[model samples]
Target chain A: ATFPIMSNFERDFVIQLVPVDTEDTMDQVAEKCAYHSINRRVHPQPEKILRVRRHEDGTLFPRGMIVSDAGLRPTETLDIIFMDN
Target chain B: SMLKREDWYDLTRTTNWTPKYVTENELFPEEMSGARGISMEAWEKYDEPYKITYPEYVSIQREKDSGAYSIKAALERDGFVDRADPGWVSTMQLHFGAIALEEYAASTAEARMARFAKAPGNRNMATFGMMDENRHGQIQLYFPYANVKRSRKWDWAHKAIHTNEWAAIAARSFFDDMMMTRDSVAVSIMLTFAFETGFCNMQFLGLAADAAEAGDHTFASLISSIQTDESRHAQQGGPSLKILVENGKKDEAQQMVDVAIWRSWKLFSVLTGPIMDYYTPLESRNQSFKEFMLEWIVAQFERQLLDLGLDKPWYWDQFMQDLDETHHGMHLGVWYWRPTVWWDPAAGVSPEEREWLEEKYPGWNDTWGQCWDVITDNLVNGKPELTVPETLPTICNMCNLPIAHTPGNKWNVKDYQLEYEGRLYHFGSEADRWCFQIDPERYENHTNLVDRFLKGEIQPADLAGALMYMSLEPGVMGDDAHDYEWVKAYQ
Candidate 1:
């Protein structure tokens, strides 16, 4: 299943990632988002993708789980939380 | 047998191209345009939706001017100025002082955009915008000048922005940031879109409706005509913003809108809020300031932001909370510090006015109203000095407003601080702090009264010295409009 991944960075920066494979893990999607957003200078902190969720109130996407199992649909919003240590 | 209007409009825009004697970077000057290194190809796509040729613009503006001035001329002999309610007179003074010269400043901004914008369409539209602002400035100034023989305070129409007046400081801080210092593209977004389309309408259109109902037909007609020009040239911002959004510069555009909207709101809260809630005669008030703000500003402006593909600002919740709390505190402060203003302030908190405030803002007695209680006791007991301020409150460095807000449920006011280059600048809110951080050089040089006091800039460092520094002459200082007569109503 090829579906485009959409993620919001820091609540303001919205990015659309290239379509990911259904077998891709949550960690893979997060890495792709981090790569695109950071390269675009949209989000300054690349190492702080602490958590990801499909909806504002949805379950957190497990880093180990496959992207398709995370309940994210094509072009759906994914909220990315960044934490700096 | 004449050329089509569209063809004439297209021809006018064609004259915007300049033979680049200098390099593109030297000619456009990235610092001046705030283009953020966006390519010219993206800017060239800016398509102004409301197209008006010079001839059409001239004809419509002439009609608006004739209509507005005709009303003023008709009212000249009507004795409305002498017979009008004192509260309505205060409203006019405040409107003219705070707004007239600011329109002139906006003309300079439009002229800059017309000369410097990269897009020919933006340049063309800005030419009309420049003309519109000049007309607004002239009409606003001339209307107030007609009242000079009736009241000396009308002289503040020209004097306010030039003085160290706090309200003037706040208004200048905002206008100077958007119109004077920023690049052409940023000015278009901040001034034209965020300020004009988002906030000024509430002051002009919404308040004009109130003015008409209140029987100040001259003011209503004047503001209504100015808004017609605003409605036309304000379209320049949308096309410019669309171009920025499509060029991957949405973050920059969003920041511009957020900063401008918040700054404008802070000033509007002080400028329009008290007048609407407290100045206009209670009988003529159609709606509370908060009600007008919710209906006109919050709902409408938010829809426009979303349509521009921008998210609600990070301070949206804070702004919503302020709509209820901030202006109430400001009204009390302005009344208490009435001596600092050029116009008379009606302690419109008679029993009826207090009831209106309480009905509009629940818990008013608990927060802002409780503070006013002390002043009422002082005035009623013949201790007017106790009601007067001897010391200045902390003024925000960014918006240049006092930091005296106390929201409901939390009975505290917090000062947001920023330490930049060995100077500690205090702000009224985080949004105000963000505004300073955006371009520190543009704001950092100016110090608030608190800063001056701390720096030993005031020689005597007392209330008298501070008043002297504020340029308040004996005759110029404000006094209670009704000379404690409003307190009897409270009793």
Candidate 2:
């Protein structure tokens, strides 16, 4: 399913529609989200990788989790956030 | 000796003929005429402030044109274009391509007012407005045409809108809504009051000041000359709204003002917003675009709104925030998508420029500044490709501009999406959503850039196919105005 998404820093001002594969893991989703911003408009956080989460919540989506397993609606907005100290 | 200029002028400007061959409704349908069930007697009261006669108009306009042309001829010796800073030149390039031909579109709107409006006085003002816009279109074309020897960019002045260039499409989206639509009354409010009277005043005022600083007196004179006519014609929106209010259609009048103001804001924030703040040389700039917005729209135009017994648009707070946020975000977006544009994007975020920005907008250094920092480092570290966008930003269904809001530490981007007739429409703000909801039928079928991209109408081979589709050839398409020289400041 094509899930529309945004993040705090990834696309600072943009909401991009991601071509999501049902089989892909959430870490893969984080990569898709980071693809637009990192090295493009945002600095590449090479030391720390990104994690997927709800827009304002702290509970991170597990790296191994897939879209259907996470129980996310097709319209849900998730963020690709930096998980760093 | 002339029997007082007002003696017979008023008599000639009024409509007294009763229709013999056709009913008045057959002659002026409410849909086209925008009479909206108001009595013909009420419409007869539509008196614009500028009570001008044709002879008087001709004499003044001829003088104005002579002044503008003579200055243009004299300024040719200045050869300002040759020595101009590329950033300043980009400002002019964007202005010429975006604004020049819209004069003819404005003329079309005015002519519609002349032929279809039920008010005799609106028709009178509109007659002159039509001529004024035609003259504006011709003169603007000639002014830029003289610079054709300098670069191919000037060619875009006449041809931009004719192409499917994204900025051209954004411009057409707004202009079509304002002028090309059927309602003559709605056109008066949207075009004359909200657009010309408010936005045009601010835009030209800022541009004229910057042109004078940039040593382009020809451009300044051109702006001033056109404004002379605009001030007169824009007065029609005033009486038109007054008629609507007194006739108990205040709600309709308010909706038009809200929709028109929001539409104008979206286009101006993307286009004029950058020109004033980024493209125009820092020394040439009289005020930040945020300052201009506050002075013109917040203070001046709001006064006019209250004077009409109208409330501020429900989206006033959002608009105020956008004055600080929207343009800066769009400017960054445009810089990244620079190649897609007709004019070079200026990376105006030098150290000193950042200082100025921080001073003008307190939080600028924190929010938009962070994003610009990333862009600067990419260039400094030889990641130039990273600065160019591979994917398109989602386009707002309402404005056709990229969906943009503030990003960074305090980032707040939300899609005001709606499902209308099984099609999902996404908007940049609630105001944009409200505009769509008001008339979903009008906007439902209009396709946006992303949808077109998704559908494969524009081939997917990176930037190669999109460039060709936009009609932008190699050298003619935009690049960095100073070719990334600003990045050196960071180094």
Candidate 3:
């Protein structure tokens, strides 16, 4: 199932709705979210890797975890943060 | 003959009487009549400031149209569209597409006020309002429809609203709440007062001088004429408001303006802000959108608010901050999603334009300009597709516009959420969320584009599919207004 998720990407102005497959890992979801803002508006931060976390609690989702395993609802919002890998 | 206008005018306007055939409640249902109980004396005192007899009104309206149409005809010989700046072209095209049909829709809204208002004077005034709106609707379309042969974008003046275009949906969503779903009294407050009195200058009046400055005299005439009508009919709001306040529905009256002010602000931020700041050529522009907004809304509308004995809206500070922020962010969003609109969007971030923006806004380069830097880089590097949208920005459930805020170090966008009856809703700001919370039932069943897309309502579930769903026919798709000519500024 494809979930429409709101991504509050770091340094991005708007919360873009990025569609992600429930089976995709958090790593893939991060790339999907980045496509809308990074390199388009926000300059590419060559040193940082993107990470997904709960917007409310700042709880990080495991990089290898599939979206469906994360207990998210349709149109749920997530904060996409920059991490020094 | 000398017992003329005023003596007889009052006699004619006072049409309220005890009805024998149909009870007042049956005739004026609370749903449509505002149901705010009031003494008969107040309804009798509904004195409209802009009074005119039918004889004089027809002659005056006829002259306004003749001058407007004659100038349009004279200009037609000179061929304006072919010689116009792409930015100016975009301005006119966008105006017609967004507003022409809304003018027609306004006529019907006026008809409701004319028929159902408890104040006979308001109904009397609204009668002229209907004709004014009908005239505005036709002239706005006729002006653009002639240009259809020059460019297909002109066709949107007629077609945009009938389709599922995002702007169309967003506009209808706002106007529907302001007038369509509201009662006569609320409509007067929301549309006539809040929209017309509050933002009419930004929409039609303030922009007229800008049109002429852009060397679009014909459109300048069109806008000013329409604005003159608004100036008159917008008076309908005050007396209607007075009735509410004097009758002790002050809280309800205040809430009506609050709702209307916020809603009108949201739509105008997207529609007028970009046009004034970005789309209009720098040399032609007399003022930044922020300057015009403060002059019109802050100075003028706020003065009117105080004069009406109404307090400034609770969200005054937030709205003022948004003046500097929301439109800039939405400009980027709309440019990124340019394919979805009918007119070309000017990048308006050329070297000189940026300087003007910085001069007016102070911190433009450090904040919003930082984002445009990447876009300029991509465009300069021949990687324009990097800025093309692959996903939709989150739409606010309240405004139905993107959830936008200032970027770079000043970036701040919030998702105000509400849960009602086992469902979650998203709003761009606290003001937007507060609007819905006031009357959840009016909005609970409604869903924005994102909701429809996720619910499997927009087929194929992709950007291309969404474009098809939005009815973007060939040649009508928006592109960079100057065909990447603006990147020369970066180079």
Candidate 4:
């Protein structure tokens, strides 16, 4: 049986966010999406590569995230939608 | 006849609410009570739906106890257990002491939750939890005591935990993080999900394996029964996490996961990981700590978290890497201080047992393997006294364990420099430097409620006392003495 997808949000740009699990909240998704923006001013250098890879269908998938090749955007506040499937 | 829904509600629900002068938040913090995230206006906002009243609860409990007692009696009749397996006793003692303290702390949580039962829903669940914890404490204590009692090592159960400075340190540190604090969310994350699910899962699995191997059907039945109850307790955290994640409070969830991972890793490294790696006899200590971690925590829970839309905690990579390394580090530290703290100096590892350690430990000649060679060499060469340090170092406050490994120090990798403060620090395996980095004041004053009870500083009749008292109930012992009935039923 397929596991339920608890949170879904759009990624406008290539970004890195901690893949929120079944135990995470949209607020956490939003806050973590904002952290990259906040930390960039202080360091001004990328210590780690944050990439978004997409399937031929243009679905982005981030490593360690559930299903699809979906990635998170560090710069943009993407809209979030919750789905049961 | 089936009871009507209203009759069931009336029987289970008590008019227990009182208008306390204090605010609800004051009495129950979100961090401690786990009620904050669930959008309940009053104490009654939660729903138990169990429909089990005190009478029904007691009857079921007594039946469960009676069932466990029967199993123990059968073990006695069959005489199947190898009472001589020192490894078996070591493994059992590790869990008994660890879980007893868990139940002891959980009892405090139940009392606090019981007070919040002003709402019918929460009241029923809290009451159930209260009774559940009592059963846990009683069953764990008696099971080990049954064996220790036969071995005439009953004091080891108490002393191995209480008298040893390092053991107390580990106990107090773990309990403080799990029990004493009001961080209900963190406790759920750390205590139930991280610590309980990871460590206890392996332990129960091991117990099941050992029981099967020894042809001890009584123990097999007994552990499976107790495990069902524990699984229920562990389930409580999942709902709380669900609520937190759905409510857009994912940072709080992340913070809790981080805290749980760090604390649970420390406890696992010492209690479960090292015990499995080093303490079990040569024949039985065949499994690697890494394999256990992969099966229980990483593959199982990691998948669950990802499914929940919770990104794995950032330390996941580090934790994965430390799976094999951490146990070796903890075993080395425990072995070094075993003489200073344990009643039996041979409790941690005996000379014959070292052969088992050498086999299970990969790269045995490198990090700890080499260090033990020197220490054992000194002991064999009539210089055992020289092995003792002037004093045991303070434990780390965060992990509640003596620092067992230098950062970046790889097993069997010579000429490896562990980096700190932007500089490389070179040290051999003999250099005991992990303790030096820990905060002294945090280590020294850390006190668990159980520690206070044993020290005469806290009363046993109060909440902690009541919990410990309930824990001492006779029938909960899962031994040859009490399990005859269950064994008869199984046959």
Residues B368-444, model 4: lDDT tens digits? 44455445445455554444432222233345454344211132221112334432222212111232233233334
lDDT of 2 by residue, B1-491 (tens): 57777788788677746688999889887878898999778888887776888888889888998899898888788798888888888888898898788888888899888988988888888998999889988888998898888788889999898988889999999999987885889899999999989788767876787788887788888987787777888888898899999988999999999999999999999988887788876776678888888876678778999898888999998788778888987888788788888889998998988888888888887788877888788888887887787666778888988777777677777777776775656687889989989988788888887667666688753468878888898767889999888888877
lDDT against the true structure, per candidate, is 0.75, 0.81, 0.86, 0.49
Report i-RMS for every model.
21.3, 3.1, 1.3, 21.0
After TM-score superposition, the amount by which residue B167's alpha carbon in candidate 3 deviates from its true location, in angstroms, is: 0.6
| Candidates' chain B TM-scores in the order shown | 0.95, 0.97, 0.98, 0.70
Q: Supply DockQ values for each candidate.
A: 0.01, 0.48, 0.74, 0.01
Chain A TM-scores, candidates in order: 0.70, 0.78, 0.93, 0.28
The best-first sequence of candidates by lDDT reads: 3, 2, 1, 4
Model 1 Cα lDDT, one tens digit per residue, B342-452: 877877778788888889988876666655665676667776776665445557788888765652233445556666886656677889998888878778789876667
The DockQ-derived docking category for candidate 2 is: acceptable
TM-score of 1: 0.82
Native contact fraction of candidate 2? 0.56
Q: List the residue pairs that clash in candidate 1.
A: none
Instruction: Give me the displacement of residue B173 in model 4, in angstroms.
Output: 1.8
Q: Whose TM-score is higher: candidate 3's or candidate 4's?
A: 3
True lDDT of residue B403, candidate 1 = 65
- lDDT for A21 in candidate 2 is 68
CA deviation > 4 Å runs, candidate 2: A1-11, A44-49, A53-62, A67-78, A83-85, B460-462
